[PDB]
Amino acid sequence: PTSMKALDHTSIASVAPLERGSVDTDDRNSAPRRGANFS
Amino acid sequence: CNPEIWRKLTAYITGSSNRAIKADAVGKVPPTAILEQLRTLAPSEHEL
Amino acid sequence: WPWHEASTEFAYEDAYSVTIRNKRYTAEVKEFELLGLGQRRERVRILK
Amino acid sequence: MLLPVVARAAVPAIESAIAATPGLVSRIAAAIGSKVSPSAILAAVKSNPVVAGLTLAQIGSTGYDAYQQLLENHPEVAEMLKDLSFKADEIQPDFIGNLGQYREELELVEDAARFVGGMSNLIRLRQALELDIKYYGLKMQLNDMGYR
Amino acid sequence: MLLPVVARAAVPAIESAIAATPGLVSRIAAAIGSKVSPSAILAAVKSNPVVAGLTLAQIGSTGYDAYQQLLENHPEVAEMLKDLSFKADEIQPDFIGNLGQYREELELVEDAARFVGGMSNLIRLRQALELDIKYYGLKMQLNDMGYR
Amino acid sequence: MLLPVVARAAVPAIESAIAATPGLVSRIAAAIGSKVSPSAILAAVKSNPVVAGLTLAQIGSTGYDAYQQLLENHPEVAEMLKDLSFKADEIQPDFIGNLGQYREELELVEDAARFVGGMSNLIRLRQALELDIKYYGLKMQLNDMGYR
Amino acid sequence: FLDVEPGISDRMSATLAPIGNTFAVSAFVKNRTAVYEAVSQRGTVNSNGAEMTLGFPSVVERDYALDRDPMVAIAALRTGIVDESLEARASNDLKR
């Protein structure tokens, strides 16, 4: 099969924000929140 | 006030240092590439 | 006339592979699925 | 009932543990709730995978492979078996007061991380700054030869 | 939580290494950061696969099969386990100056390589020129008789 | 890095070979060029699959199955291990040069012939590289005086 | 009998019709001359004078039609002579 391993190892031209923050937040999921009890 | 920079990054984005370019043999270079070499030729610490 | 050597058979196999979310996924592909042909066939030949 | 792939590894395990020592038989009879006879507890194991996992939790040396194989073949039993087999650990008296001294400092680590990038990027940057200087010289020398 | 497929290969190997020697137990307790008891570090191994990989790297004789099977079944732990597992490969004092003398040679090797083809083509051509002249005479005899 | 599926079969095989005999130290020092300690060559095997294939090809007692498994797993090392796995078969005294042994060598000669051109061109280039250095200086001095 | 097949022929033709506009022969030699004008930057008294390149797809096409390598006659145009190891019809198809 046509290999793409040489084409695979590239790099994207990185360029900095004006404001930092929100870095390590890529893959996180907390539990769903409940509703209040009804009466 | 520096004449070398405006020659080096026209040599890069035209492909020819000394000889003229014809009107038909005109290629294309994306602005990300010229930014990545402008970072090396004229250095600063502010991307803006 | 001798049609046989002035043509070749019509068959092609290939595969695509990609690692997404550190999971490797692979899709094989045949020659007739690309032309949108339901019936697969060996009886066709392509002139060179 | 119970899967035979599980049973072929679980039944001689429990039978061999009983043959090794009999004091575990009354223990699993009290823990599961069966009669103290080995035929009764073995029929309970062959009938119910929850009971089988409870027995394979009560015997731990010779039953770990059979327990993990039951956990492979029965995915539905896992949460119920973990809920039934639960023992709360004891807490040290000084643990929360010792933890409260570190709030001033995990915040420092996170403020370093928000600048550097990932937590992995912080670890690799700290390793690179702790690294020896001859590696910097070797990097400059390989780039001096024309290798990148 | 660690997979049962990894756990079947990981837990008895760690238990066998501890039963073989207890001097590794304080070593892995200081490396990982748990209590010194085998039950506590085994709870840490069963809880966290990063801790499992750290223990299977600290015991090096018997844990290679379990280490590579953990690396197969948990592919996402590899980068962080490589970040945590880092030791300085010690550099020699004469290595950079001994390396700088070979620029004269590697450039010639790469230029001959570009003339021939690949490095494989260069190695095969060097073997063909190293091979005996009797083979050239034998292949001329086969070409005279008709064997291509 | 090295594949874990083939590493689980490649590392204990050469480990058992080193534990069986210590006579492979000169072999792994001459064939690979690594450092003389048994840990450095094992790290070299774990880092480089070409070095792993060389250590599987240097012995034929138990590592043949691991060599065939690495050949089936990584096809890109096949031609390189075929090139580095070449021993010049000395002579068979008879006339019949059967292709059970000489097929690789005559194929290598014909590959070099397909590169160069004529068989006589290969023999001529073989001889011209066999010649002394002084004939180059003689040709250069005749071409310097004004003759060609 | 050779029964023609439409449909497949139209699919292959509709794929080839953009490819023929982007592999024209007059747009390769301009790249050749641009490359060689850029990398020379010298006077050609030295470097053994001028050099010439020539490419003939009407000969490459005949070698493809006869199931021959186009890159074996080109290797023979340098030294002129042919090799007697191959057979008579191979020598004839090389020499023509």
Curated annotation (Swiss-Prot), chain B:
Where does this one sit in the cell? Virion
How does this chain assemble? Homodimer. Associates with the polymerase complex.
* Main function: P1 is the major inner capsid (core) protein of the polyhedral procapsid, which is responsible for genomic replication and transcription. Forms a dodecahedral shell from 60 asymmetric dimers. Binds to RNA and may be involved in genomic packaging.
Protein name (Swiss-Prot/TrEMBL): Major inner protein P1
**What is the species of this protein?**
Pseudomonas phage phi6 (Bacteriophage phi-6)
Swiss-Prot record, chain C:
Where, per UniProt, does this protein localize? Virion
What's the domain of life for this entry?
Viruses
- Please describe the quaternary structure of this protein: Homodimer. Associates with the polymerase complex.
Summarizing the function annotation, the protein's role is: P1 is the major inner capsid (core) protein of the polyhedral procapsid, which is responsible for genomic replication and transcription. Forms a dodecahedral shell from 60 asymmetric dimers. Binds to RNA and may be involved in genomic packaging.
By what name is this protein known?
A: Major inner protein P1
Query: Which residues of the intact protein are shown?
Result: 578 to 625 of 769
